[model samples]
Target: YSSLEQVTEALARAGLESSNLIVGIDFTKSNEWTGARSFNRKSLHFIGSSPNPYEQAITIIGRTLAAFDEDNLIPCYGFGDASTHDQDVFSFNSEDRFCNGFEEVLSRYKEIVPQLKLAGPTSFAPIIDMAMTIVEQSGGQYHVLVIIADGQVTRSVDENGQLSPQEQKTVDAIVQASKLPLSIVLVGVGDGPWDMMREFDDNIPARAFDNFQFVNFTEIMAKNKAQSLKETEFALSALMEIPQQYKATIELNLLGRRNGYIPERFPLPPP
Candidate 1:
């Protein structure tokens, strides 16, 4: 038992040493839906506290993930805001080298919230692809993308009525990037029916990619009495698969090396 436990622990530890956390927040107008506003009012009226569901999700998940991150720096981004899509969300690209801590991440997030205009049509593909690119560039570091959203993707509908083309692209990217040392946590907020999110959390995707966890803020709050505890548990549950996923990736790399397989980076062929 002891020998097996030591070997089992080593696999997870090897990957935890150099892990990165990427955060993407949904800045869509759906987050301002009536139900969410009412929920916020009730909380404020009853408990003198009103929290934006998006901010709550980010704070909880980001803080929990930061506990494992060595640098305490998170690359944070926002999508669905048409106004400043061209501008960097945290200005990390120019000013700061790292985000420092979860408090700093939360501060920057809150600061940017009022400055950007929340519009329609949320797209996850861009940020999802960006996370994969960062991890790929990291060479060997494990990475997790924590995405907080209030609604499903609504950007893919074409003029001829081609539904969810953008969402399909995201799903394909997720499956294609499954082999990388990375994972994704989708935190669904607000009272909207997350039927699409439920579909993404299905068994096939989880098994095929082996690295997706969906946590609904409303559902999590319903399950726990204490808000703080609920948030922590929600974040922890979302990351529970990290060790297992990391171990699998690490073992696969070792096997490839033993088989004299050198991993090659190939650029996309021109159309």
Candidate 2:
């Protein structure tokens, strides 16, 4: 069976009319953060002929999630390479952020590589902000954003509410977004401060409902090689929270009488 077909079929079983899947890639200081002491043929972000980590995640996660989207389009973005692409959110290409599907997203990513400089520090606020903007106008459709990153992010502590401006902004963005219909899947590659990542995943802010999950590709690669359905594992781990998030959002919107989309079965895809 096609693994993606199962992923898509499961979503159909969930009673969703439509949803959106967006992609974000890290260009911060280029491939240097990909556990490569140097950027060469061995790099995970290799601009060579083979698929890089970013593309791999896109194919596995993007293709898997895009199945649920059913809309035939996936928007993509680039962040953390601030010097050149200064905006908190910028397209892989200078002209547009839209792609036909994961295939088009991959095609555009390859073409855009030669044009990007891998400019600056890592940040999620911009990408989350972009999601907020899109979901607000998304018209009852659920939205998911996939971020492929090196995890060299800003994680500072706040003293008397004095967190680093960037960290604070990211947290604020997340809280504001928690009320909306967008969820984020942060794919962390290489050695990252994943303790912080766990906080992002496990600790949803008090004012917010849970909407984030982080995937460690290194762990995925090391453990699942013997399995034929490796990509399916990604969908499992990456989207584990989606059903609940969807139910919560729907039950929430029920106050306004819009969320009549009750599931045919509550504990679907059963344990």
Candidate 3:
């Protein structure tokens, strides 16, 4: 998964070979987890390191998209901070990229020097709203968002709970705006008490709302503790399958009665 060739080769098996949707990424400011206040934990660190795994995630996503041979799936990137004044809004044209910013973002990082903005304290709500718009425009076409950040925000509670007042308004707007179809995969790339992140992940509606799921990279890997990079990548890929599976269900529902009252021979929530 380190090289593009390898990533593409693997994706060839998944049937993701089209560029019908865009992958929007937000690396909220310095892209560092410095200012993000921690809970049971002390401070936050992105991907357990300073430079941040933001670019790596984007690279993986891009390679996955390329592997599918998708021509239409353009990637949109954005940074959130006091300047933008809005968290969710993103610039797709690349012309809107802020601060002469792309180059030194990862700073001294080896390969991921200039792919993402890696830019702030994150607010998950605003971007959700933006995604809803993209989904509507695409006519329920599947879109995936991989946000790698501390998942913290100024207006948020930060105490491992649901969205606060401001947060709820933003989320409500996103839910209301979801006329098309969409899926969001929140990758907790920062070091912080991830209780908040997991809460958001679990809150994703089962149905009647755009498909959503999330994974806390470090937390999930905490169990295995010694998983290799490729193993980590594979694990991440498997976690991603949840949303895909959910979407498949939606697709089946759309194809209603085709199988004609298919009986559930197994336990609750078919695999």
Candidate 4:
């Protein structure tokens, strides 16, 4: 088949079904947006009452993923909050960690966002590391991690416009994680510069690799207001690369096993 024909066939394949989703929202100090609203505008905080951009992005992306999932269950996590020093990442909802649907996720987010303390050095490694853990534990099931944040920490930038040691750790984690059936979507909301974000993307594989996507939340919102298709296009574009990357990961894994580089995993009984 020609390349175009092969692509069309691949798109039509039923094997492209969806995977489980985990939403990771960055609740760092810079992501706060309470100052932008006047008294009148404050009424519309959040979508009204939940002003944090992290909550907003979680709702949008979580709902988008749930539309494809059979169960509509999503595990939502938060990172970079200083007060909660016991752990680097935790479920946004303490009572019920995994939400049943998008509405449930939104409701739970609105209720907890105001109470949580936001802090940061905006490290991406911890969250990425968490996803790697889940991927390993889930056996071969695919996963997607959506990270909503203002931007990378300013200190991540350096004298040569290269990633500092701390920042490079995140890139290394991502490159290694790419071998698994996991993809990351980073939504940048605030007006802060994304020098670190751009630098990181320059080294990562293309979106077609299903590895990472860095999108500007403000730009997407603006385009959506002018044309609804823009929003749909953005969501689909973020997902289109997943199946291709999943196939590649699977093939590479099989190759590793064939070369005896990877050992077969044996299941253990649950306690």
Worst 10 residues of 3 by lDDT: 262-271
Q: Per-residue lDDT of 1-271 in model 4, one digit per residue for the tens?
A: 2222333234337255556787766667665442242222232124464444555566555645654578877766667666532135667565425767767766766776676667666667666767666666656467777776666743645687576664666776677666667777777766545655676677764332547778766555555243345445445545556666657667656212222222222211110
lDDT of each: 0.59, 0.64, 0.45, 0.58
- Per-residue lDDT, model 4, residue 27, is 64
Q: What TM-score do all the candidates reach, one by one?
A: 0.74, 0.81, 0.60, 0.74
Candidate number achieving the greatest lDDT relative to the actual structure: 2
Once superposed on the true structure, which residue ranges of model 2 sit more than 4 Å away at CA? 14-17, 37-41, 82-87, 93-97, 156-162, 200-204, 254-271
Error of 2 at 73 (Å): 1.3
- Give the TM-score comparing model 2 with the true structure, all chains together: 0.81
lDDT-best of 1 and 3: 1
Residues forming the 10-long window of minimal summed lDDT in candidate 1:
262-271
lDDT of 3 at 244: 50
Q: Score residue 267 of candidate 4 by CA lDDT.
A: 17
Residues 1-271 of candidate 2 have per-residue lDDT tens digits of: 3376687567567654356888877777645655553223355566677677777778877665665655567767777654423246666544544788889888887877666567665667777777666566455467877778876456456637455656667767777766777777788765554555675544446754677777877566556354446666666677766766777677767212322232111110100
TM-score of 4: 0.74
Off-target runs (Cα >4 Å) in candidate 1 are: 1-17, 34-38, 41-50, 83-98, 155-163, 203-208, 254-271
Question: Candidate 1's residue-wise lDDT over 31-117, tens digit each?
Answer: 656245436533211212355566666666665555466677776666667642312232322332446666766666666666666
RMSD each, Å: 7.7, 8.2, 10.7, 7.2
> Candidate 1 or 2, higher lDDT?
2
